[PDB]
Amino acid sequence: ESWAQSRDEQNLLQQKRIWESPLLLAAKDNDVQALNKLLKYEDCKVHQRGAMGETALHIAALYDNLEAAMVLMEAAPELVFEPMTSELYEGQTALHIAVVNQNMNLVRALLARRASVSARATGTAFRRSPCNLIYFGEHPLSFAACVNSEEIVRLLIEHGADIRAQDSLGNTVLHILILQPNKTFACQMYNLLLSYDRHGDHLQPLDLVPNHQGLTPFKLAGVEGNTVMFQHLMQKRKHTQWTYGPLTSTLYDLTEIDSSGDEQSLLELIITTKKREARQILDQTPVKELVSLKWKRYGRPYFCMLGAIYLLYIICFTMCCIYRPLKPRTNNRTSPRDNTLLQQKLLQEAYMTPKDDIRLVGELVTVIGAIIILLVEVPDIFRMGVTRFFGQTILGGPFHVLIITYAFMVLVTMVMRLISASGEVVPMSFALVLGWCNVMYFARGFQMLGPFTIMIQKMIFGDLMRFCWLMAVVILGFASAFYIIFQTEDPEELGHFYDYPMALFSTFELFLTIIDGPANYNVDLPFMYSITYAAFAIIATLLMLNLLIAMMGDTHWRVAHERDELWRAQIVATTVMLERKLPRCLWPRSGICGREYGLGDRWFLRVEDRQD
Amino acid sequence: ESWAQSRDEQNLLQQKRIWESPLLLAAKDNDVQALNKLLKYEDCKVHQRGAMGETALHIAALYDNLEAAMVLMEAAPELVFEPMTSELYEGQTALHIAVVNQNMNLVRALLARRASVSARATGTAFRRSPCNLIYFGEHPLSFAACVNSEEIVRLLIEHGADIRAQDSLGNTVLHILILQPNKTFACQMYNLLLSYDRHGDHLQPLDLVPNHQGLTPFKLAGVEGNTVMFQHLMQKRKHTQWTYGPLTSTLYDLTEIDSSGDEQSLLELIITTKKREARQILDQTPVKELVSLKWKRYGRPYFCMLGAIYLLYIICFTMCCIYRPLKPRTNNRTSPRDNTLLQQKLLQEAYMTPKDDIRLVGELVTVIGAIIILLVEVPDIFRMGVTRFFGQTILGGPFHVLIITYAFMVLVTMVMRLISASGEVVPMSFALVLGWCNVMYFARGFQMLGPFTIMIQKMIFGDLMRFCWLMAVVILGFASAFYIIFQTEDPEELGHFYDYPMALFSTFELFLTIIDGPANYNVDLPFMYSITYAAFAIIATLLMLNLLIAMMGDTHWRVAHERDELWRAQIVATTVMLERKLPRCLWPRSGICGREYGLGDRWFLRVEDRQD
Ligand SMILES: CCCCCCCC/C=C/CCCCCCCC(=O)O[C@@H](COC(=O)CCCCCCCCCCCCCCC)COP(=O)([O-])OCC[N+](C)(C)C
Ligand SMILES: CCCCCCCC/C=C/CCCCCCCC(=O)O[C@@H](COC(=O)CCCCCCCCCCCCCCC)COP(=O)([O-])OCC[N+](C)(C)C
Ligand SMILES: CCCCCCCC/C=C\CCCCCCCC(=O)O[C@@H](COC(=O)CCCCCCCCCCCCCCC)COP(=O)([O-])OCC[N+](C)(C)C
Ligand SMILES: CCCCCCCC/C=C\CCCCCCCC(=O)O[C@@H](COC(=O)CCCCCCCCCCCCCCC)COP(=O)([O-])OCC[N+](C)(C)C
Ligand SMILES: CCCCCCCC/C=C\CCCCCCCC(=O)O[C@@H](COC(=O)CCCCCCCCCCCCCCC)COP(=O)([O-])OCC[N+](C)(C)C
Ligand SMILES: CCCCCCCC/C=C\CCCCCCCC(=O)O[C@@H](COC(=O)CCCCCCCCCCCCCCC)COP(=O)([O-])OCC[N+](C)(C)C
Ligand SMILES: CCCCCCCC/C=C\CCCCCCCC(=O)O[C@@H](COC(=O)CCCCCCCCCCCCCCC)COP(=O)([O-])OCC[N+](C)(C)C
Ligand SMILES: CC(C)CCC[C@@H](C)[C@H]1CC[C@@H]2[C@H]3CC=C4C[C@H](OC(=O)CCC(=O)O)CC[C@]4(C)[C@@H]3CC[C@@]21C
Ligand SMILES: CC(C)CCC[C@@H](C)[C@H]1CC[C@@H]2[C@H]3CC=C4C[C@H](OC(=O)CCC(=O)O)CC[C@]4(C)[C@@H]3CC[C@@]21C
Ligand SMILES: CC(C)CCC[C@@H](C)[C@H]1CC[C@@H]2[C@H]3CC=C4C[C@H](OC(=O)CCC(=O)O)CC[C@]4(C)[C@@H]3CC[C@@]21C
Ligand SMILES: CC(C)CCC[C@@H](C)[C@H]1CC[C@@H]2[C@H]3CC=C4C[C@H](OC(=O)CCC(=O)O)CC[C@]4(C)[C@@H]3CC[C@@]21C
Ligand SMILES: CC(C)CCC[C@@H](C)[C@H]1CC[C@@H]2[C@H]3CC=C4C[C@H](OC(=O)CCC(=O)O)CC[C@]4(C)[C@@H]3CC[C@@]21C
Ligand SMILES: O=c1c(-c2ccc(O)cc2)coc2cc(O)cc(O)c12
Ligand SMILES: [Ca+2]
Ligand SMILES: [Zn+2]
């Protein structure tokens, strides 16, 4: 916005000041004879500051003018130690520019005059940001690795580059290559930089050194969805046991992958990333066999056991609403439109028989069970929802909004029972619907979990809610029309639209065709009704048929074209929740440990397969 | 389960005890220097057993080490006569391991030291099981044939390996090649092992030796759907008569294919197996014209006659239920909600007029026709498939269950008629519905109805069982809400939810939109009715749209491309059933008997075809 306008004016007044200054211009235009005349005129203003604090060496390096960049050196050798001074390109020297532009003959002549290989481009354009378009690090050795130039990397380290150097984000030169868009070229540069880590006394192998978020180069490849570097780093963690003809028993490490409770694991960090490429890591041969192992053995059976206890809680709540205390009414019927026969009992007369004491036991099971919902989930939606992730699990999305809304409605029914307020049917009727609609979500884990089952259910609900916005204006147009047509008529003969909230609810029902069209045949209806309702019935039929076709066309686009899994991240983030809630004695750790088989303290997973 | 927990701990215990013992380690690492050290120290415990009861010679053959394996054999040659004595790898010798690993120079080393080529590896990890990735037999000829090694098969026969050795479930080496995943490589090995059957004095040749289930290799390729080896084994059963340009008159054997009437044939095995590529053999040439021969000539006439006799029998049963004996009621009505006017007559009253004697003939035809159902179908589910194929063949046809359940309901109605019990309308109502829905069975015998009935009848138990559970959750949740909203109201105006079972039935009907939404308009309905029913109608719309989208994917797309294949497989199961039940005087045996043409007592089918 205001900042994007600021970058654009900054680049235009850069080119404006390179044209209105001759030594900046000849460095750009590679006018080698124009340098000799101006520099012999008593070295005029060789300490230039252009738009981005640039000197004339920065211009000559930027446009790959090797012949013009030489003349600046013998004229004043103090320009090779000069950075750019603006906020956007802060700290960038000429050695950074020639490395990114891959100018071989220039970068030797810079090192020939002792250019610092440990400079730090701290500017706002050299920071990881979606507004920035490249993130190449902060060091010249980091710039050489990202543009894929093997010969510069061998040249820079020879002059003393530090491969252990880190950024302001803590990323070393091996963290940055995982962030690069071309994966295959970054895979060759990874093997190169590890070969120069001879260094057996640095107390840490360099591909274990964490950034300021604690992530290793292994975990960062799992978070950023870099599947090419993930499979490359996994051969460091395999161990082939035997090969019996076509069979092979491979043993995987599972130290930085499986959860230990005290530390965030790779399975959790894929979920909170919310990226589309990070879910491809869940398809990989150590991780894919781990998720299906614990969602077959502990994760799924405990999911169905918690849903069976919730079903007994809602049945116990349902019985207390059916047998709610009611007495015949005390006052007389006011209007002839008053249908009410019964009313609620007061608190003193609610409990005076032994059959009410059986109900009182059931009413206390409900309230105690409603507090437990608040005591375990008011932490959860703070932890889960706004901090890490929301709506990408099974039992997920509008489950946690609704079951919190359930337990709120039960405690409202308790208050209205105590102060003997009228209208407890209103918090109960919400709580029956809210409570039983949550049972449909536990029914989602009774499935074999295909790749396009839960996301299609989530999709169809998403299109129906978009259809309800477009049909609200169609109802409001025709309900207002139907209201003023029958506004001069007698509602004893046709009372579908007798006041305006009823006319709105009738037109909603006629749209879905769940009540019949109004007709009497013993009296003359207005003529404007018949042509309006014939227009309404054609519109409502076509809009309901186009809804079905639009759900078919949107189903095809997300199965055949969007090509996103969604089905492994749902069973991961469900299994993470049940593992933090249950104690350790009910949850054995997946894999098998060492010290009785002699491999360490590490929890290995054996995978046996057939090559064919 | 705990089976993989016990299996994975032994593979780590194996690698542990290799790492513990110096003799097992240096043989594993092919460190033959320590092999000479540990033998000249002492003739030690060189008959020690690790995890899976193995020796140092088993390890050296497992990890493909020529040099380490030799040193064990000159030191102590008695290790070659040693099987693994655990339960997982019981019976396996080092000769088995070298063959599977295809270490050809090690095979010469063992056979020069007279390694027994008839050892039977009868372990747990060698049986045919869905938990095993391999089923290679129990013999070294069987192990060599399944890894596609010609030079080892030639080497083992020359050293006296029995080519007709059998597993402990019956299979010879010719059976095992059909059970292999690579069909093309098995065909070359099949031709090779018959080229060593020169020594025929054995009454059954190798391609005519049954296993413990009676199946030959030709029938086993039929059951397993091995269409590659089926066509190759059909070349042995052909007989080409003449070639007249592009024409060819091939004569087929039909001994193991056609129903012999004593043994289960090839047609009977393919129908009674739960496989899909086995059904593809119904399009192979000698079977395809055999099936069309039986149906066009004797199957379709006997099926249309049986469909016409059943149709008249149900019309006779229908008129006996319409004219069932009823008299006016004796007592007076109790409540004004009592709607009953008539009740049943008794046996003394039900047969007094000549119209009752006409009905008595029709009732006896009904009872006799239900006993004949229980005599041709009940001694078919007790001898053949005692309780198993009574449930196993239901995927082929559910109409066995419906016609037996019909035949009981007629006899339940008979017993109640004799003891004058009340409530004959309950067993009749099941019998009328089950009587007329069994007419839909005979729709398969028509080309106009057959393929279209396949698409209509095809319902999916993965999504409709999901729909029935979620429908029941909405109905129990919203009928409970609708019950307590109208619990205080007058039910003579709106009586849809007057007690709780009717509210369950009204909400069921409103979900399917088969009764109108409740409305009076002459009285004030409660406010929570409009909120709940609008929420209910959007949920009921969504669950229908979830059901249509579920019916448009990956199963109905499969049936829409396979309905001609699925209909021609119902023709086979109908024809095979009719050929068993009808006597041999009404069903002539197919093909042409070659007794009067000099061909043996075999029944030949003649097929003329154009190669062009
Ligand atoms: C009847 C009308 C009144 C209701 C109006 C308000 C209702 C909402 C309407 C809002 C406006 C209409 C727009 C459609 C909905 C959002 C768009 C969307 O993405 O759809 C998503 C629906 O949502 C889900 O099923 C997943 C859960 C995430 C969202 C949380 C819902 C809020 C809970 C409160 C809910 C109400 C309970 C409040 C009362 C207690 C799914 O779309 P998708 O992308 O195809 O799915 C792929 C999943 N993926 C994204 C992970 C890849
Ligand atoms: C999430 C997807 C769905 C979208 C949600 C919204 C869906 C729609 C939900 C609607 C909820 C209810 C809204 C109106 C309720 C007022 C009724 C009332 O009190 O009537 C009173 C009158 O006063 C009126 O009639 C005022 C209504 C006129 C304007 C309608 C409001 C526009 C909705 C804003 C949003 C629309 C935009 C949404 C689309 C962009 C009483 O009238 P009476 O008793 O008949 O007597 C009159 C006296 N007389 C006899 C002299 C005549
Ligand atoms: C696993 C799920 C699969 C599905 C299987 C489901 C399982 C089986 C499901 C249901 C069981 C069988 C049906 C129940 C019928 C009750 C008996 C009856 O007919 O009513 C009789 C009495 O009954 C009452 O009055 C009940 C009063 C409220 C009881 C609340 C539950 C108490 C449970 C305690 C804790 C539970 C622990 C739960 C938490 C762990 C007759 O009553 P009335 O004379 O007609 O009316 C007057 C009553 N009034 C005076 C109060 C108004
Ligand atoms: C004691 C507490 C329980 C503890 C149990 C401990 C062990 C539990 C362990 C495992 C439990 C589950 C194992 C069953 C086998 C899996 C098959 C399956 O999932 O069906 C199908 C899903 O369809 C469904 O949605 C559900 C089908 C079953 C009906 C309802 C189940 C019970 C509901 C409540 C009744 C009362 C039960 C609760 C009582 C209150 C499979 O679908 P699909 O074929 O993959 O379709 C893919 C098609 N596509 C590829 C095109 C997309
Ligand atoms: C191919 C498909 C199309 C062709 C289908 C056939 C053609 C169309 C089908 C039917 C024709 C149309 C209706 C029938 C005649 C009209 C009604 C009538 O006159 O009946 C009269 C009574 O008569 C009776 O009581 C009927 C007895 C019922 C059982 C019939 C036994 C048949 C015996 C043969 C066994 C067959 C062996 C089966 C072999 C497997 C009516 O008299 P009423 O005034 O109503 O008084 C009733 C008093 N009562 C209640 C005391 C009785
Ligand atoms: C009393 C006399 C009645 C008739 C006799 C009894 C009927 C028998 C009729 C036919 C025999 C069997 C039919 C299925 C064919 C073989 C499958 C099988 O055997 O297993 C089935 C057992 O079946 C059941 O458990 C009950 C069926 C429930 C149907 C629910 C919807 C229909 C409702 C309509 C009526 C509404 C009721 C409302 C009325 C109040 C289910 O197993 P599966 O799902 O195939 O296995 C899962 C693996 N899969 C996912 C890969 C597929
Ligand atoms: C109803 C009266 C009762 C009388 C009882 C007395 C017993 C005897 C009664 C009939 C004897 C039938 C056997 C002989 C004829 C069959 C063989 C045949 O020729 O094939 C014919 C088809 O078949 C037919 O069109 C005839 C069907 C007869 C009625 C059967 C009703 C089925 C009832 C079940 C309801 C099912 C629906 C269920 C849906 C829910 C046609 O053959 P084609 O292909 O044209 O041949 C090529 C000829 N061409 C070369 C010249 C072209
Ligand atoms: C004034 C009226 C419109 C009441 C307003 C409340 C409704 C807008 C919301 C509240 C929560 C309900 C929901 C309750 C649970 C269901 C199941 C559904 O998830 C499933 O399990 C079905 C599969 C699928 O989503 O397609 C998602 C939302 C739905 C239909 C409901 C959508 C609409 C409801 C009635
Ligand atoms: C599903 C598509 C076709 C429409 C989606 C719009 C709904 C989200 C809204 C707008 C129309 C409905 C409304 C229509 C009018 C009624 C009036 C109602 O108040 C009364 O019933 C008073 C009746 C009287 O005074 O006689 C409150 C909300 C309600 C049920 C509805 C609430 C929600 C609905 C379902
Ligand atoms: C006196 C008794 C009858 C009280 C009711 C039983 C409660 C002790 C339990 C069983 C039903 C509830 C559960 C209902 C559902 C949730 C979700 C949870 O599953 C997940 O964490 C995954 C959610 C997701 O992946 O989106 C399992 C337990 C929890 C919080 C609840 C924990 C405790 C509750 C209140
Ligand atoms: C006294 C007389 C006039 C009554 C006539 C009796 C027939 C109406 C019934 C009695 C027993 C027979 C039935 C008995 C069993 C068979 C197999 C068939 O069983 C199946 O459903 C096959 C299922 C499958 O293959 O998938 C159903 C009807 C049929 C041909 C028969 C149809 C008609 C028959 C001759
Ligand atoms: C359990 C899941 C896997 C499938 C369940 C679906 C159906 C088998 C159920 C759903 C709700 C229905 C029931 C809902 C309530 C009714 C009441 C009915 O009659 C009464 O009890 C009294 C009615 C009256 O008062 O007149 C008996 C069964 C019925 C139709 C239904 C029987 C079967 C239905 C279709
Ligand atoms: O059920 C249908 C049908 C339908 C289904 C089967 C038929 O035989 C006819 C119409 C058409 O459009 C819809 C459109 C919808 O929005 C919702 C629906 O449930 C349907
Ligand atoms: Ca109607
Ligand atoms: Zn497409």
UniProtKB/Swiss-Prot annotation, chains A, B:
Expressed at high levels in the gastrointestinal tract, including esophagus, stomach, duodenum, jejunum, ileum and colon, and in pancreas, placenta, prostate and salivary gland. Expressed at moderate levels in liver, kidney and testis. Expressed in trophoblasts of placenta villus trees (at protein level). Expressed in locally advanced prostate cancer, metastatic and androgen-insensitive prostatic lesions but not detected in healthy prostate tissue and benign prostatic hyperplasia. Keywords: ANK repeat, Calcium, Calcium channel, Calcium transport, Calmodulin-binding, Cell membrane, Disease variant, Glycoprotein, Ion channel, Ion transport, Membrane, Metal-binding, Phosphoprotein, Repeat, Transmembrane, Transmembrane helix, Transport. Glycans are attached at N332. The chain crosses the membrane at residues 302-322, 360-382, 398-417, 424-443, 464-486, 531-551. Residues 500-519 dip into the membrane without crossing it. A motif (Selectivity filter) lies at residues 515-519. Residues 572-576 are annotated as: Interaction with S100A10. It is found in: Cell membrane. ANK repeats lie at residues 18-48, 52-81, 90-119, 136-165, 169-211, 213-242. Glycosylated. Changing G385E: In HRPTTN; induces cell death most likely through intracellular calcium overload; increased calcium ion import across plasma membrane; may lack intracellular calcium-dependent inactivation. Residues 1-301, 383-397, 444-463 are cytoplasmic. Its main location: membrane. Residues 67-77 are annotated as: Interaction with calmodulin. GO terms for cellular component: calcium channel complex; plasma membrane. It is a multi-pass membrane protein. Calcium selective cation channel that mediates Ca(2+) uptake in various tissues, including the intestine. Important for normal Ca(2+) ion homeostasis in the body, including bone and skin. The channel is activated by low internal calcium level, probably including intracellular calcium store depletion, and the current exhibits an inward rectification. Inactivation includes both a rapid Ca(2+)-dependent and a slower Ca(2+)-calmodulin-dependent mechanism; the latter may be regulated by phosphorylation. In vitro, is slowly inhibited by Mg(2+) in a voltage-independent manner. Homotetramer. Probably also forms heterotetramers with TRPV5. Interacts with TRPV5. Interacts with S100A10 and probably with the ANAX2-S100A10 heterotetramer. The interaction with S100A10 is required for the trafficking to the plasma membrane. Interacts with BSPRY. Interacts with TCAF1 and TCAF2 isoform 2. Interacts with calmodulin. Belongs to the transient receptor (TC 1.A.4) family. TrpV subfamily. TRPV6 sub-subfamily. This is Transient receptor potential cation channel subfamily V member 6. It comes from Homo sapiens (Human). The gene is TRPV6.
